[PDB]
């Protein structure tokens with residue numbers, strides 16, 4: 001399934017977590033390969 | 049890269065390599081220190097913590 | 098590779114030496130080509146499945162690359178493949194059999210081979 | 219005396235660099251990028267050591283990885299022929315010259331000698347290693363020590379020495395499975411380790427792919443060479459002896475100076491490269507690459523006999539380093555980086571070559587579709603002009619008449635028909 005990065009940012013900032021941590025986590029997941037970008041980088045999807 | 053061609057004076061107060069080498073050898077050969085009890089107790093407390 | 102080309106030239110020279118002719122002529126070239134092909138043996142295990150998978154991959158990747166817009170779904174892919182075949186199937190029985198076959202092949206590709214990815218609505 | 223004047227006159231020519239690039243390896247077809255890189259490798263750079271503390275080498279190492287039949291060894295043979303001091307060795311075994319120093323009684327002269335490895339013998343020279351993957355443990359250890367420390371230590375038979383190994387390393391190798399895999403990184407395709415790969419400034423990948431026109435031309439050259447030797451872009455390459463004299467003169471009397479570098483552009487480009495490398499999420503760039511760029515820049519300034527570095531050499535080194543860095547990435551990352559960095563990679567490029575690449579990609583797609591569906595190829599290949607125009611617009615190119623009239627269009631036996639607005643091959 002797909003999730004928009006803006007949705008994740010909003011959800012975690014409402015929890016008052018820093019945005020840099022979320023960005024780093026997304027980058028690490030990209031390195032591992034679980035997260036992939038769609039045709040537009042606004043929405044990501046999950047692989048394994 | 050630019051300054052390597054002209055002057056080996058990057059920092060004002062660098063110790064010359066020969067001087068630094070000789071000074072290190074001098075200090076190593078000359079004397080040898082040991083701790084103090086007042087500092088020793090503080091070190092013990094910090095290590096336990 | 099190019100080593101096969103050099104081997105072909107050597108075999109042509111060998112044929113010319115055998116027949117004592119003074120030049121390499123197309124008969125020797127044809128014979129060397131024939132022998133080198135007959136020496137090569139094809140692996141036996143399938144071709145139709147691979148061809149269908151390659152066609153599906155080509156279509157999906159062309160869709161992805163040509164547009165920054167939205168893409169199609171599984172039903173759209175099946176309908177597109179059937180529309181393309183339309184000129185190749187003459188009866189309804191063959192059409193429905195091929196539809197079942199392609200649906201099973203697509204399921205195998207998406208779930209077993211993991212080549213194609215599936216997403217929810 | 220007059221040779222120096224001839225060298226200066228050749229330097230006065232504005233296109234000496236392209237002449238030198240095309241002068242390398244007359245007997246090998248294609249692989250122009252490899253020849254361009256070998257040009258910088260041969261000409262070299264300049265070591266720098268502020269005081270006796272920070273040593274930075276000027277030798278540009280080259281690594282080649284190729285599928286069988288790509289003629290990797292012929293490049294090494296040519297380099298050995300041209301180079302004034304070049305040593306050749308193979309890692310498979312039974313080499314005429316070893317890769318490790320040892321003390322022994324020579325079989326012929328019957329004398330007690332210290333025979334240093336090929337690395338020591340090539341002081342201020344070139345060392346060539348064939349079959350790089352087949353090397354055993356000792357050879358790998360010695361190569362790592364000689365590349366990272368630039369000195370070889372010996373402790374054998376009561377002899378303790380350190381010897382200088384200021385040499386340039388050029389190596390050739392084959393992939394692990396026997397064929398290069400575009401879906402895997404360079405490190406995953408090669409038996410070597412990451413620390414060894416990190417030493418090399420330039421990495422080249424030679425992948426074999428079935429192109430009918432290129433295969434036809436290569437076969438034509440091979441058969442022509444065989445027939446000739448029976449017992450019974452560049453305007454003109456320089457003579458080999460003239461090239462040798464130019465190389466010697468440039469090495470002896472050319473010392474380019476970096477007193478005109480532009481730090482702002484370099485810093486901005488480095489920041490952007492690191493940013494997008496982290497955005498993709500694999501193999502980020504590091505400062506080392508910049509150093510290589512500078513060295514390559516120096517090499518370019520040594521080609522034109524320039525005593526000072528200008529922006530042209532910097533941009534060419536940028537292009538070379540970016541190509542080397544991108545080519546080692548896997549499919550998706552490589553494609554994204556190539557699309558995003560099209561600004562820098564297009565320095566002194568040819569638009570006609572890019573259009574030819576687009577046409578070849580479209581032709582390959584059509585041929586693959588035909589082979590998969592029909593089960594066999596058709597007698598003709600055709601492609602609409604509209605797709606080519608659209609892709610050129612995507613690359614910001616709006617006119618193609620010069621491409622139609624270009625020699626590259628005719629060389630690949632393409633034709634354009636206005637009666638149908640089509641391209642035929």
Ligand SMILES: Nc1ncnc2c1ncn2[C@@H]1O[C@H](COP(=O)(O)OP(=O)(O)OP(=O)(O)O)[C@@H](O)[C@H]1O
Nearest residue numbers: 099245246247285286287288289290291292392436
């Ligand atoms: N572009 C080319 N121009 C001329 N000859 C070529 C070219 N490509 C391949 N060859 C020829 O192909 C043959 C293959 O042998 P070669 O030693 O050059 O291979 P190699 O690439 O070193 O292979 P290996 O990976 O097995 O070590 C040689 O005779 C070489 O002349």
Ligand SMILES: [Mg+2]
Nearest residue numbers: 290291348349
């Ligand atoms: Mg070889």
